Design an enzyme around this catalytic site. Structure first.
Site, PDB file in Angstrom:
ATOM      1  N   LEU A  67      -6.603  14.499   0.370  1.00 12.01           N
ATOM      2  CA  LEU A  67      -5.315  13.831   0.393  1.00 12.01           C
ATOM      3  C   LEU A  67      -5.482  12.322   0.317  1.00 12.01           C
ATOM      4  CD1 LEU A  67      -3.445  16.059   2.964  1.00 12.01           C
ATOM      5  CD2 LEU A  67      -3.352  16.041   0.475  1.00 12.01           C
ATOM      6  N   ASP A  68      -4.499  11.675  -0.296  1.00 10.41           N
ATOM      7  CA  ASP A  68      -4.525  10.237  -0.469  1.00 10.41           C
ATOM      8  C   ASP A  68      -3.946   9.541   0.755  1.00 10.41           C
ATOM      9  OD1 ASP A  68      -5.668  10.407  -2.990  1.00 10.41           O
ATOM     10  OD2 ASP A  68      -3.715  10.505  -3.992  1.00 10.41           O
ATOM     11  N   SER A  69      -3.936   8.210   0.697  1.00 16.10           N
ATOM     12  CA  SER A  69      -3.176   7.429   1.662  1.00 16.10           C
ATOM     13  C   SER A  69      -1.687   7.716   1.537  1.00 16.10           C
ATOM     14  CB  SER A  69      -3.467   5.942   1.456  1.00 16.10           C
ATOM     15  OG  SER A  69      -3.063   5.514   0.168  1.00 16.10           O
ATOM     16  N   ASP A 110      -0.389  10.526  -0.011  1.00 21.50           N
ATOM     17  CA  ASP A 110      -0.086  11.953   0.041  1.00 21.50           C
ATOM     18  C   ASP A 110       0.175  12.414   1.466  1.00 21.50           C
ATOM     19  OD1 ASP A 110      -0.322  12.321  -2.693  1.00 21.50           O
ATOM     20  OD2 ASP A 110      -2.469  12.756  -2.582  1.00 21.50           O
TER      21      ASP A 110
END
Lengths: 83, 80, 85, 52, 90, 124
Positions: free
Chosen positions: C41-43, C45
């Site tokens: 997961l992203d920052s 997301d």
């Protein structure tokens, strides 16, 4: 919810969850007061009640208007619309 | 066109201020009819239809009046 | 009425991240996984994740605890710490 | 809670409430069909009172 | 017991003895209550006119109604001082 | 500092610290103070004129500016009452006569006198 509550204070309303054990018993008293209140009041208020329409004759009130005319002519009063 | 009541007739039956006219003749048993029942709407409908028909016949002369009110209103504009 | 349990909180978050698409896998997920690295997961997301976390739980949370819950167990113990189920 | 992230089941209501739904819903449209029929000239607006 | 002490004017009572002065004050007081009871009684009758009449009270007791409204400015407490502290025709 | 009276209360104080006032309702609730009922940590220097920045102070709506919102309210007033007055010029007249009354308009029935007929009488 039933969170804990400090049982020390006594309120007139009972407090948080007042469920005292002889509620089957004490309700025999208060309702016995309550019914015993109401019929005791309803008789006492009975001679103070009356039927609104038809307490006196129209002849009485018409003679009261006659007495009004006898009063008002002696004071010599114009009508409400006379100028 | 029911006939007009007498003066004591308005004074007797305690008819309301606005109701006392030529058309009040059908009224004075009608409410009395209503006194037999307890103001139930399925009861006493023919005589309220009579009172209504009296008043609709009055309505048509109300309208023919207001129609007559306007011809001379045109004629006043025809003064020039 | 109804009372929340631990394993309810567990299975909700598991079945929650099963329905999300920018996850890494459907089998990598544990009770101790990182949201960022272990799920890919992203920052940005994880914020949409936490938005679904708060809507799905009912309860809303501030931004102060938003970067506090970076792993799954932190979020589970957080939501179990509140009495509003 | 048995289903998570799937189709929700058909709800279970008791018989005594749903019969009251059926009863009151029957009485509502029945009462409507009474009163609309009984005032259909008047309620719709007909037979004008202006002399031709 | 329903006693009836006499009425004493404020004219020619020699305002030095407290006896006649206090009697005149009390007389002009109690007589004013007698004057007030007319207003109270006609109100008691006028409401009964309204009770029986229904709609036609406008013409039943118009004279009784304007009787009430005429008595209203002239039936109240007015003070014994005003007649006592002053003299008309002077 | 903030409002007009606040700056008009500054030269009174001699030994008060003159902090910036701020409505405690408009502090966020998710910070965890001492007084969670009032969003207030214990040894907080209160404001000169505290009770307009208490929680018990009035609500102080935050979406519209006050001076701006006054315009919107008076605009709603104007768009109602002016157009209603315009409809008085656009009204059509009615179709029947107002109904008349017997006994010369029942002037005798509403009490009345022939001398007092002018204050009575309805469409004789």
């Amino acid at each position: 919810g039933r969170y804990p509550f400090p049982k020390d204070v006594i309120s007139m309303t009972g407090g948080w969850w007042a469920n005292p054990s002889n509620w089957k018993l004490n309700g025999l008293f208060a309702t016995g007061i309550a019914v015993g209140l109401a019929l005791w009041v309803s008789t006492a208020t009975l001679p103070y009640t009356r039927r609104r329409e038809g307490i006196t004759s129209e002849s009485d009130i018409s003679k009261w208007n006659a007495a009004a005319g006898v009063w008002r002519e002696r004071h010599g009063k114009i009508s409400t619309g006379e100028a | 066109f029911p006939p007009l009541l007498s003066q004591e007739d308005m004074k007797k039956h305690k008819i309301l201020l606005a109701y006392r006219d030529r058309c009040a003749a059908l009224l004075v048993p009608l409410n009395e009819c209503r006194k037999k029942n307890y103001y139930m709407p399925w009861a006493c409908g023919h005589e309220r239809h009579e009172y209504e028909m009296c008043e609709v016949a009055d309505f048509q002369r109300r309208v023919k009046a207001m129609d007559k009110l306007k011809a001379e209103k045109i004629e006043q504009a025809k003064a020039a | 009425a109804h009372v929340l349990t631990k394993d309810m909180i567990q299975e909700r978050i598991v079945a929650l991240l099963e329905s999300f698409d920018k996850v890494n896998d459907a089998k990598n997920i544990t009770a101790t996984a990182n949201l960022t690295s272990d799920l890919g997961l992203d920052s940005l997301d994880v914020v949409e994740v936490v938005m679904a976390i708060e809507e799905e739980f009912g309860l809303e949370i501030p931004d102060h605890d938003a970067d506090e819950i970076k792993t799954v167990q932190q979020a589970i113990d957080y939501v179990s710490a509140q009495p509003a189920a | 809670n048995y289903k998570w992230n799937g189709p929700l089941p058909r709800p279970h209501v008791s018989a005594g409430h749903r019969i009251a739904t059926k009863f009151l819903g029957a009485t509502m449209f029945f009462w409507m069909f009474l009163r609309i029929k009984e005032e259909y000239p008047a309620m719709l607006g007909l037979h004008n009172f202006y002399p031709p | 017991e329903h006693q009836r002490p006499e009425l004493v004017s404020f004219d020619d009572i020699n305002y030095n003895d407290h006896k006649k002065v206090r009697e005149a004050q009390e007389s002009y007081t109690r007589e004013q209550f007698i004057r007030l009871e007319a207003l109270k009684t006609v109100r008691k009758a006028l409401e009964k006119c309204y009770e029986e009449s229904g709609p036609n009270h406008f013409e039943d007791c118009k004279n009784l109604a304007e009787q009430y409204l005429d008595m209203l400015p002239t039936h109240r407490l007015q003070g014994y001082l005003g007649y006592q502290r002053n003299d008309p025709s002077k | 500092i903030r409002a007009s009276f606040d700056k008009a209360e500054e030269p009174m104080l001699g030994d008060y610290p003159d902090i910036d006032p701020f409505p405690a309702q408009l502090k966020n609730p998710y910070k965890k103070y001492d007084d969670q009922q009032d969003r207030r940590n214990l040894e907080e220097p209160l404001s000169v004129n505290d009770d307009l920045y208490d929680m018990w102070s009035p609500d102080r709506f935050t979406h519209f500016k006050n001076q701006d919102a006054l315009k919107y309210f008076i605009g709603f007033l104007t768009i109602f009452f002016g157009a209603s007055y315009v409809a008085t010029y656009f009204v059509p007249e009615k179709a029947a006569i107002p109904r008349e009354f017997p006994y010369e308009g029942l002037w005798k029935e509403s009490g009345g006198t022939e001398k007092s007929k002018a204050f009575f009488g309805q469409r004789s």
